[PDB]
Design a protein around this nucleic acid. Structure first.
Length: 627
DNA sequence: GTCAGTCAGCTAGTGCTGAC
DNA sequence: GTCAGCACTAGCTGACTGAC
């Protein structure tokens, strides 16, 4: 229809009219700092949107490109960047539209499908790469990933999702989408009724482009309000850290971690054979060939039929992991426990990994999220890295890329050091000034032995108790904590003596406990001023939030510094799980990489913590499970 | 020849029970 | 706290009797 193809030359298909091609004379400065009059083509909705946000937009395709459009970018301080894509996955999908929003101008839409003169994107490249231009993005991780994968470089960034998430102080989990944020702050409904319209088509209809335009112009108003809201809340440090840490997360997701297919196959074969053998052994032991082991009720019934009892001559009524410890005086239960371990390991890692492995590159790629965790630490999904077993044999599957070598660095006692810093415990700080671990010190006070005489087992008990009592556990739960996660049986009187001895000397932590318990505050702040406001008081989380948040801040600062300091030797930041950072570097630059990693981690530690001095243990690893 | 009354397999949901 | 895996209990949906 002649109505519908009015603007086909610029790849626009009319749906319900509501589109006009209008030209007006603009006033722009020249490269010689001289105002120049230029005529531009911009489209407009025939029906004015009820809100005050802009809806004008240029479209820049192969034909319509005008060289003078690059002058908008000059002498700016913020610009709104949003990109539309055919699908979610970065590897299987391209970028359809790039949008730029410069204040008091329409939104410039670059149609990458109808762009072939590579000088077109030069202005986009320079506005993206400039470090003096605060690019505003919504959900910066997704857009940054798509841009980096296609040879673009984007340097500065300001994500409205991070600002909104931090400002809410973890009040609500859901929300924090573009429509919700704009409604909450600027009092406007974006009418996001586009139900994921088909983007693959070369031709794009009016509603899609206009909805994409209001998603870019609305970011500048959010920038203005969120900047002031953050400034009034003293959240600028953590916001800056998160914004600059967006890009390292994109690097980690893009590069991934390679899996040795041959070793994975060998381990899977061996583990399946071991599972079959143990299953057969249990089958003979349970004396029921038809028995299915996985049925929890059925194994309970079978063990009941076996009539094995307790030390109290009590029949088993539960196969809880700790209840198995109470019933260990038989070969049956040993076989059952071994089978449970093998089954969980097998069907949780070995049979699940092949789905995640991309046969195109034979690498595992993760989806890192940086503010879903309450404490602030990174959380992985799709493949859950923290759920990967941490035993030696399982991790060896992960190898570096061909012709490379891993560097692995991990903090030591970052929680305990941060606790010492915040609580200002004099004895801990005077201890760490002379390089003695707080596990060794805790063991020394517990066992009354001299420092050189401390063994490894005392260090283990210290490892238990320091974590136990530095997050405000009542001494009753110390027994459960030590037994369950470390296996050390303990008596209540021993727990009482340990509690008294621990809080008699480390005075600072006692003062911290007293203050936090007395105030019963509903709001807490970390050393990066990451504020959280709970619904109701909880002593455990009240004690746990500051140290964990500060540890997350230290890791994020380390990644931000590392991503800038590793660009010379072209090292990839691969993963960051727990207090551990992994970088892959070419085999020549091993020494330089080690120095860079250590320096970045130490500087990050020294930025927030001042009294103490963190240390990092770095080992060059052939495989992630190296020595 | 035909329709009730009762016998079920199937699918869901909840109950309950375990570890990464 | 998240997660799968299974009895058990229930309600439904066709087929095997039961009939005057």
């Amino acid at each position: 229809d002649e109505i519908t193809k009015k603007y086909i030359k610029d790849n626009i298909i009319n749906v319900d009219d509501n589109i006009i091609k209008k030209k007006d004379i603009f006033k722009l400065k020249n490269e010689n700092n001289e105002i120049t009059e230029c005529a531009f083509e911009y489209f407009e909705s025939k029906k004015k949107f009820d809100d005050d946000i802009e809806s004008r937009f240029f479209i820049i395709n192969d034909n319509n490109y005008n060289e003078n459009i690059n002058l908008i970018y000059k002498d700016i301080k913020y610009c709104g960047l949003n990109i539309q894509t055919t699908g979610l996955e970065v590897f299987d999908e391209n970028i359809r539209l790039i949008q730029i929003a410069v204040e008091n101008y329409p939104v410039i839409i670059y149609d990458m499908f109808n762009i072939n003169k590579k000088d077109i994107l030069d202005g986009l490249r320079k506005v993206l790469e400039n470090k003096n231009i605060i690019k505003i993005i919504q959900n910066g991780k997704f857009d940054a990933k798509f841009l980096l994968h296609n040879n673009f470089k984007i340097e500065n960034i300001f994500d409205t999702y991070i600002a909104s998430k931090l400002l809410d102080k973890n009040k609500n989990m859901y929300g924090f989408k573009l429509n919700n944020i704009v409604e909450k702050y600027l009092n406007v409904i974006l009418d996001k009724q586009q139900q994921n319209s088909v983007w693959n088509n070369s031709l794009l209809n009016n509603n899609q482009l206009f909805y994409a335009a209001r998603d870019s112009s609305c970011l500048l108003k959010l920038y203005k309000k969120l900047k002031e809201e953050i400034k009034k809340e003293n959240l600028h440090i953590v916001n800056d850290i998160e914004n600059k840490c967006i890009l390292p997360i994109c690097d980690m997701e893009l590069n991934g971690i390679k899996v040795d297919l041959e070793n994975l196959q060998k381990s899977t074969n061996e583990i399946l054979n071991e599972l079959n053998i143990e299953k057969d052994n249990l089958k003979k032991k349970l004396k029921d060939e038809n028995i299915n082991v996985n049925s929890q009720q059925q194994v309970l019934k079978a063990l009941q039929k076996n009539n094995v009892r307790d030390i109290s001559n009590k029949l088993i009524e539960n196969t809880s992991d700790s209840n198995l410890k109470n019933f260990l005086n038989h070969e049956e239960i040993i076989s059952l426990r071994n089978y449970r371990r093998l089954y969980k390991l097998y069907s949780a890692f070995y049979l699940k990994l092949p789905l995640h492995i991309n046969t195109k590159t034979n690498k595992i790629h993760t989806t890192f999220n940086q503010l879903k965790t309450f404490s602030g630490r990174f959380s992985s999904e799709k493949p859950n890295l923290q759920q990967i077993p941490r035993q030696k044999n399982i991790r060896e599957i992960f190898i570096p890329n061909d012709n490379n070598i891993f560097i692995i660095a991990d903090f030591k006692q970052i929680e305990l050091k941060i606790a010492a810093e915040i609580t200002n415990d004099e004895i801990m700080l005077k201890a760490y000034n002379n390089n003695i671990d707080l596990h060794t010190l805790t063991a020394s006070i517990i066992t009354k032995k001299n420092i050189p005489d401390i063994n490894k087992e005392d260090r283990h008990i210290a490892k238990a108790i320091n974590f136990g009592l530095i997050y405000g556990m009542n001494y009753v739960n110390l027994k459960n904590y030590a037994n369950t996660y470390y296996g050390l049986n303990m008596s209540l009187d021993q727990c009482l003596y340990f509690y008294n001895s621990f809080f008699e000397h480390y005075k600072g932590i006692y003062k911290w406990h007293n203050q936090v318990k007395q105030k019963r505050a509903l709001q807490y702040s970390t050393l990066s001023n990451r504020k959280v406001i709970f619904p109701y008081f909880s002593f455990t989380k009240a004690l746990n939030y500051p140290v964990q948040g500060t540890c997350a801040d230290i890791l994020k600062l380390a990644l931000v510094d590392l991503y800038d300091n590793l660009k010379d030797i072209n090292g990839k930041i691969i993963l960051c799980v727990h207090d551990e950072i992994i970088i892959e570097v070419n085999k020549k630059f091993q020494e330089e990489a080690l120095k860079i990693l250590v320096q970045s981690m130490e500087n990050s530690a020294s930025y927030f913590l001042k009294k103490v001095k963190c240390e990092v243990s770095v080992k060059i690893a052939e495989n992630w499970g190296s020595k």
